[PDB]
Every structure is written in structure tokens, then in C-alpha cells.
Write a protein that binds this DNA or RNA. Sequence first.
RNA 1: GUUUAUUAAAAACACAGCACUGUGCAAACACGAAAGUGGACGUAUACGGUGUGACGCCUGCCCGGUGCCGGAAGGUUAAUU
RNA 2: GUCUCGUAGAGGGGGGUAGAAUUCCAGGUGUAGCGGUGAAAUGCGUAGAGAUCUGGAGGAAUACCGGUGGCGAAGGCGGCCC
Lengths: 148, 271, 117, 103, 55, 77
Amino acid sequence: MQVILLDKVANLGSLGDQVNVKAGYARNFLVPQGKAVPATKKNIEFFEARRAELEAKLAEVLAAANARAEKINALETVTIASKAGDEGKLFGSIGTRDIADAVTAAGVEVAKSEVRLPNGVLRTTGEHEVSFQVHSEVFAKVIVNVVA
Amino acid sequence: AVVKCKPTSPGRRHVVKVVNPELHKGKPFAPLLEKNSKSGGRNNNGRITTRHIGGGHKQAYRIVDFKRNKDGIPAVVERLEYDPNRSANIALVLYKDGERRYILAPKGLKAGDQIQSGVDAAIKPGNTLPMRNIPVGSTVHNVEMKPGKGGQLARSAGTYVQIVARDGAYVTLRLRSGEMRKVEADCRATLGEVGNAEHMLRVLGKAGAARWRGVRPTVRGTAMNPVDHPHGGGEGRNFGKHPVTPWGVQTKGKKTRSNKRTDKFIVRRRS
Amino acid sequence: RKQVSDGVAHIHASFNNTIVTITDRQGNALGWATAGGSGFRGSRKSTPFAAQVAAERCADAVKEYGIKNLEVMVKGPGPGRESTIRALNAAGFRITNITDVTPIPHXGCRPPKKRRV
Amino acid sequence: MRHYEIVFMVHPDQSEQVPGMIERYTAAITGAEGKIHRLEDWGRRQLAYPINKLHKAHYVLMNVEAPQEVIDELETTFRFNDAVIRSMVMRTKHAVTEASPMV
Amino acid sequence: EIDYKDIATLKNYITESGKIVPSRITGTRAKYQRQLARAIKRARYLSLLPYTDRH
Amino acid sequence: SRVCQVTGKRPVTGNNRSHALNATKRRFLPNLHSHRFWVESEKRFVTLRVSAKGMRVIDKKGIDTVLAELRARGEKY
RNA sequence: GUUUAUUAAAAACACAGCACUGUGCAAACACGAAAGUGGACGUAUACGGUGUGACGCCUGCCCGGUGCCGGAAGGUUAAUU
RNA sequence: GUCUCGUAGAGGGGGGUAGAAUUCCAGGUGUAGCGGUGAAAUGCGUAGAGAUCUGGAGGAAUACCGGUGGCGAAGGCGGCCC
Ligand SMILES: [Cu+]
Ligand SMILES: [Cu+]
Ligand SMILES: [K+]
Ligand SMILES: [K+]
Ligand SMILES: [K+]
Ligand SMILES: [K+]
Ligand SMILES: [K+]
Ligand SMILES: [K+]
Ligand SMILES: [K+]
Ligand SMILES: [K+]
Ligand SMILES: [K+]
Ligand SMILES: [K+]
Ligand SMILES: [K+]
Ligand SMILES: [K+]
Ligand SMILES: [K+]
Ligand SMILES: [K+]
Ligand SMILES: [K+]
Ligand SMILES: [K+]
Ligand SMILES: [Mg+2]
Ligand SMILES: [Mg+2]
Ligand SMILES: [Mg+2]
Ligand SMILES: [Mg+2]
Ligand SMILES: [Mg+2]
Ligand SMILES: [Mg+2]
Ligand SMILES: [Mg+2]
Ligand SMILES: [Mg+2]
Ligand SMILES: [Mg+2]
Ligand SMILES: [Mg+2]
Ligand SMILES: [Mg+2]
Ligand SMILES: [Mg+2]
Ligand SMILES: [Mg+2]
Ligand SMILES: [Mg+2]
Ligand SMILES: [Mg+2]
Ligand SMILES: [Mg+2]
Ligand SMILES: [Mg+2]
Ligand SMILES: [Mg+2]
Ligand SMILES: [Mg+2]
Ligand SMILES: [Mg+2]
Ligand SMILES: [Mg+2]
Ligand SMILES: [Mg+2]
């Protein structure tokens, strides 16, 4: 299937590229996510005539993501409280939803889909390092302090 | 206790009863009762689809709490009871807030005992926790297979499961069959063994005692005519063929599991 | 094909045979020889000379790896306990350590019944 | 009212929890009219042989006089505490207060 | 009295391989040899002493 | 019914033939799958029961054109 | 106890007991182009299939044939290309 | 024969636990033998055994101490802890 990329897609190409991808790749991911469109004559001519504003919007999105990442980094450390045993091990667990809620209460709005926990979901009291992905290329870090 | 009947009649000579002088002698707890009428082994086409089922005693269904998700609130066992629907006994328990429920009765549970469920419950028989919070090597019963679905494994009298290992999001279990089975560690399990272990020691003693339980006679295929069963036929007692079901499938060792969807959870088959 | 220069020679000295296996320090085998495989059978297979020949053959088999230093682990009561070590030293290796690793149950399983010969 | 000597070994990665465990256990003993004759913290020591693939452990020694019920509860706590890798409870003829050969 | 914590003293009554030395070799009285054996076994369990030298 | 919502493909009958040419009646069924199609112009997913051929037809013609055809035919989705 | 309503009531069938075997639950299995339903609001001390037939003392040798179970290095081998 | 203080002891019943070793399972290295006997053969091995390293499962018994040593009516009783 021939498609026109509407953004930067890793291992595929840059915006405006015309690429041949597997039909399922286009059908179930790229088009529904908005990262590409079918390479019909209408689409090709329309995009080529109306192209540059899209890079302007992509730059605006990247700048907004950078600003949000800077705010997240400036937030530094966020503290979450739960219940645990005397050994410091939590009976329950601390996940993306409540981490994002704590960050939002701290001031920066982050969705649960932007939380990236490398070593699974937190289960012990102490300090952990969590990552945030607000853009496909930028990354932020937050210290999480779990207390009883 | 296991009690042998005296042979005052040929139908009583071989009877062995399991007599428990702790079960409630009165009526069950009505709000947790439902009617349950009989099928005779017939489906909604009205056809017999499982042979040898019919008759037997009328039975009310007791609503049993297999989920055990009323967390953080202690309950006290009020009494043990007979349940016609299953081999295990059940226990009526009263929660602190005034709610009553039925649970499977673990071995050793008696009236006055306290039970609890949830991540912070004590490691004691009758308490229910996610297996993430149960020590490896423990004996448990009424084990969930999906978190929140409710207990499904080791529910029969005297049965239990062993937690043999815990790796990541999964625990490995030794089932009563001998199978080693992976289950999510967020699945719940109740500490201890199912009670009423003496159940298997009973001896029915007469044909009628099976009829009381809703079991109708088995007719051997070799006792039939060929039109009825692959085994039928013969001038006298004849066989001369590989044993099969009434529908022709070998019935002496041929395996019939075929579930590629759940194969990934079987660490080791029972044999 | 990778140089090691620091190996371990395991001697399995049983009453009937001697097995010599040279590994690296992590237990990965590089080569082996046995008294039974070095042209000896029957009563000849269970002699110190056969064990020495097996040790020489094992040294030859590991010659490519360029081993210089050898620890030695001897296990079993067989007659090839010391001839193998002597041959290994004569082959040019530097014998750094010698250790007995014969297993001894601390009780253990019941042994087979006594032979009535 | 009997006299006990309790030695327990903590996983080295949980060495920071040792003072908390010591305080909790001593409080549990003293709650039921128990006495602590001796309390020593040997710190991390090298094990003579590996235990659970470890090579060092944090040793704590206590000498107390406590009822059997609280001693059994303490043993249950040791069994179900994942940090305690090995414990040992012994009866002693009398109270022991003198310094151990470790210190 | 023999103390299972007295590792320095206990080490005089074990071989290089860790085995308990006979009282007929050490010149120890029998009553104290029994206490020594008990103390050594306790120390082995607490991992203050090795069971075998291949540790 | 085992019918494609896009092409109208449905079971057809024919014969199995053996080497001795014995004919026994059989059916040929369509390769149908229930699939969630993203409609961009309505910001939603619509589920259709479609043959693999119908999926190719949607790839070629666009889900909007196909859905307009379905509305014209009166086939609800 | 059951049976050839209408020439056979029996030594036949069933039976409690016994064994083999299948079945980890959306169970095996069965009715059903299917959806579903029975199995079971049961969960291996459970459920199906098969043989034997209270109880007592017992149940020896043969895996070459046929079947079932396991293996997968090699030979041969379909559509496809 | 009873009481008071103390002593040694594999005396008994119940529960827990530790280390060595055997077997089995999985994986890594590695290659033509292994195992067995008086000598052999059956058996195991190129479908990768035996050997060596790592992880796991499980049952049974407790090296050294240990002794014409101890305890128990006899039969008998042996790691450690309660
Ligand atoms: Cu239809
Ligand atoms: Cu083929
Ligand atoms: K019942
Ligand atoms: K029958
Ligand atoms: K027949
Ligand atoms: K017949
Ligand atoms: K006949
Ligand atoms: K523990
Ligand atoms: K009759
Ligand atoms: K009949
Ligand atoms: K069965
Ligand atoms: K009889
Ligand atoms: K009888
Ligand atoms: K045969
Ligand atoms: K055969
Ligand atoms: K083949
Ligand atoms: K005593
Ligand atoms: K023991
Ligand atoms: Mg109908
Ligand atoms: Mg049946
Ligand atoms: Mg029933
Ligand atoms: Mg039967
Ligand atoms: Mg007939
Ligand atoms: Mg037929
Ligand atoms: Mg005949
Ligand atoms: Mg015949
Ligand atoms: Mg057939
Ligand atoms: Mg032998
Ligand atoms: Mg002779
Ligand atoms: Mg015709
Ligand atoms: Mg009738
Ligand atoms: Mg008649
Ligand atoms: Mg008649
Ligand atoms: Mg169902
Ligand atoms: Mg179905
Ligand atoms: Mg159903
Ligand atoms: Mg018969
Ligand atoms: Mg054969
Ligand atoms: Mg086969
Ligand atoms: Mg086994």
C-alpha cells in the first residue's frame, strides 16, 4: 500500500514522503493514528499544494512538548502516600494513573499514556525514577517518593 | 467420623457413612437460597447430552461466595452446614457490618473462628489474599484463574493447591491433578485445605444410594447390539475390537485436550 | 579458538576407568580423554598407565587453546589419581592448585548390597 | 517465664531496616512484661557458606526473658519476614548479660 | 562452658576440612567433647563455621 | 447470515469430486471477518462483517464511499 | 431391583465395590451448518468413557502382531514455487 | 516410700529447620565413548551420552563428633532448634 507520511515515523521516513507499507500497517496503525494517508491523486496534489503549514504545526507541537517537558523537569520530585508493612513493602502498588494524578495535583497535567515505568509498577517505599514521553522524540524524568 | 453400618439387611452390610456432629441440624439461611430444578442431562434441544443423569433428591442452591472480595472487614463463623450441591461443607459467616455470607469450609474451621480477606489479611486458614501476598510454598484452595473472576480451582472436599514458585507477574501452582500451572499473581486464593477430607471414605453400599444422588444406570456397550454401540454384538460374550466410546473414539489412552489458546500456561501436564 | 591460559583439569578416577576433562574456570569443557578410549580395555583400562596416557591425550586435545596454568580437581578412589597429575605436569602445564572433590554423603542414600564373590 | 537467646540474620540489602526491626521486637517483648538482658548488633559478617546465593548477612543477637506466646509470635514474624534469612531461638539456663565474644 | 559464638576457640577443635577432631587426639574430656560437638553444630547452622572446606 | 456487507458474497454450493469422480454436494463459504474500520470523517469506528475481498475493496475505494453505498442499499451498520 | 406390551423373567441387564483411561474449566464429552445449550451455577475427594461385578483369598509369563503413548536425527512425501 | 537443691543422658511423643549426597528435569560447554566384570555381554551413547558448570523438583538418611561411650523394662533410641 502506498501512503504519504504526515509526520516523522521512525524507520519509515519524514513528512511528505511517499512510502510502500504493508496494508495492515497502514490500515490498523498509521491512518487511524493520523501519521499517514493513502497516496491517491487527490491526496498527493492536495498535500503538495498545502504542505508547509503542516511543518509549521509540527514545529509548534514540538515546541509545546518541549515546554511541557521543561515544566515536568522543573517539577522535580513528587510524593505519593499509600499503605505498607513494617518492612517498607507496599501491600498494594503505585501505578500510572495515580502517578499522573499526583503530577497533575503538583501542577503539570500529564496523561496516563505519557507515563513510562521501566521496571514495572512501583511496589516499595522509597525513591524511584520515572520517565515521561510527551512527544515521540522528547523525554522527561521525575523522582517519585513513595511513603507509608 | 467414618462409621460402618451393621449388616441387619443385605443393603446395609457394606454401607459406610461420614457422620459430622458439627453440621447445623436446622434449615439453611433463607436469603442465600435459590431454587435449582433438574435437567436429566438434557439440553435445550431436549436431547440427552450427558448420559446417566436423572431423578434423585430435590435440592436448593446455596449462594456461595467464591470471590471473597469483602476486604478489610472481619467475619465470624456462625455455623457449618451441609450443602447438597457439593462435596465440601459450607460455613455461614457474619461480617462486622451485619452482612451474612456462605463460604467453603476449610479444614479446621469451626464456629467462633475469625476470617478476613484482602492484601493486609493475616496468613491464617480461611483468610483470602492475592497470591502476590501469600508465601511461596503455602497450601491454598478456591484459587482464582483470572483476578476478580472468583475461585475455580481446588474446591472439592479435601483438595488444595501448592504455590511452588513466584516469577514476575505469575505464580506456579501444583494442582491436585499433578499439573503445574501458571496463574496471575493478582489472582486470589484462600489459605488452607478444603475441609471434609473423609468424603472419599464413604461407601454407598446399594444401588439405590446412587439413585438418590441423581445417577442412572450405566449399560455396558458390550451388552448391546451392533446397531447401538461399536462394542455390541456376539454369540455369547465376544469383544474383539479396540475399546471405544459410543461415538467411536478410542477410550483407553487416546488424548483429547486440544486448546492451543491456554497451552502457554501449562508448565507441565499431569503426566 | 579463543585463548584461555587458565584452565581446570577434572579427573574422574573410578575403579574401572579414568576420565580427564579440561575446562576453563567457568566449567566449560575444552577437551577430554579417557583411559578406555586411549586403546585400553578390560584389566588394562583400570591401570595408572592408561590414566597417564589419557592425560597426555587430553593435553594434546587442548593444545590449541594455549593453556598455561591448570588447577586440578580429583574425584574418586581409582588408580588413576596421581598418574594423571604427573602426566599433566610433565606435559608442560603449570600446576597451580590441587584439590580433592570426592563426594561424601553426610549420613544419604542407601548403597547397593554387598557382593558375594 | 523462661530465658531465650535469639540470633537472626538479615539480608544485607535490608541493613537499614535492622534498627527498626530491633525496636519492634524489643517493644513486643517488653509489652508482655518481658525483659531484654542483652542486645548486640554484629553488623555485616561474611558467611562461612552461601545462603540463598548471598555471601554476607547482618547478624543480630538478643538475650531476653519472655513468655512462650510472645516467643512463638516472634518466631512466626521471623518465618514470614522476607528480610530475615535465618533465625535461631535457644533456651538458656539463666539470664545472660555479659558481652559476647563477637564484641 | 563452650559457647557456639566463641569461633576462635571452636576453630581449635576442627580440621582444615571442617571436621570435628576426635577427643582422643585433642586430649579433651568426654563431657566437654559433647558440648564442643553441640556448639560446633550450632555454629555451622548459623554459618559461623563451614560444614565442609569446599565452601 | 454468512454474508459480506460490502460485496454481498455469500455461501455457494457445488461438488466435491473424488478421483473416481463421485460427486457429493458441498458449500463454498466466504472468508468473512468482523473488523473495526476507522471512519475519520465521523471520528469513530464502525464494525463491519466483511470478506477479505471486501477489505481490499475498502482499501481501494475508501470507507466513506463504501458506507455511502451501504446506506444507498439500505444495509444498516 | 430390571427385561423380550402379545410363546423366553433367566444363569440375561442393572447393582454397590474394583481398575484402566480421558478431562485444568471457554474441561473432556454430547445436541447443534451456527448462535448457543447440556456437562455444572459442578472444578480432579470432580466430571466423561470403558471393562469387571458384594465379600474373602487372589489376579502368574508374553510388547513379536494390532491399537494407544512418547521421540524426531535420517529416508520418503501434498498444495505451493 | 514423700519433699527440698542440683547433675548427666541417641529415654519417649509432637512440630520446625539445616547441610552433604543420590535420582530426575531444563539449559551452557564439549565429543566418542560410557557403564560393567575375573573376562564379557545385556544396557546407555552421534536423536549428542559419559564428563563439567548453572538453576529447579523431590524423597530418604543424618559424615565428622563416636567411644568393649550414654539412655531405656525389654523391643530399642544418633544432625540442629522449640
Ligand atoms: Cu443471518
Ligand atoms: Cu512433506
Ligand atoms: K454434600
Ligand atoms: K453396567
Ligand atoms: K460384544
Ligand atoms: K453378545
Ligand atoms: K447373542
Ligand atoms: K523468613
Ligand atoms: K422372575
Ligand atoms: K436383560
Ligand atoms: K474415573
Ligand atoms: K465374604
Ligand atoms: K462381606
Ligand atoms: K504384544
Ligand atoms: K506392541
Ligand atoms: K517427515
Ligand atoms: K528429659
Ligand atoms: K529431621
Ligand atoms: Mg426450542
Ligand atoms: Mg456415566
Ligand atoms: Mg449434584
Ligand atoms: Mg459403573
Ligand atoms: Mg442382547
Ligand atoms: Mg457399528
Ligand atoms: Mg464363545
Ligand atoms: Mg477369540
Ligand atoms: Mg471404529
Ligand atoms: Mg555394583
Ligand atoms: Mg564360586
Ligand atoms: Mg448425483
Ligand atoms: Mg418398566
Ligand atoms: Mg413375552
Ligand atoms: Mg412369561
Ligand atoms: Mg459452558
Ligand atoms: Mg461452543
Ligand atoms: Mg451452560
Ligand atoms: Mg459380566
Ligand atoms: Mg516394540
Ligand atoms: Mg506417533
Ligand atoms: Mg518425583
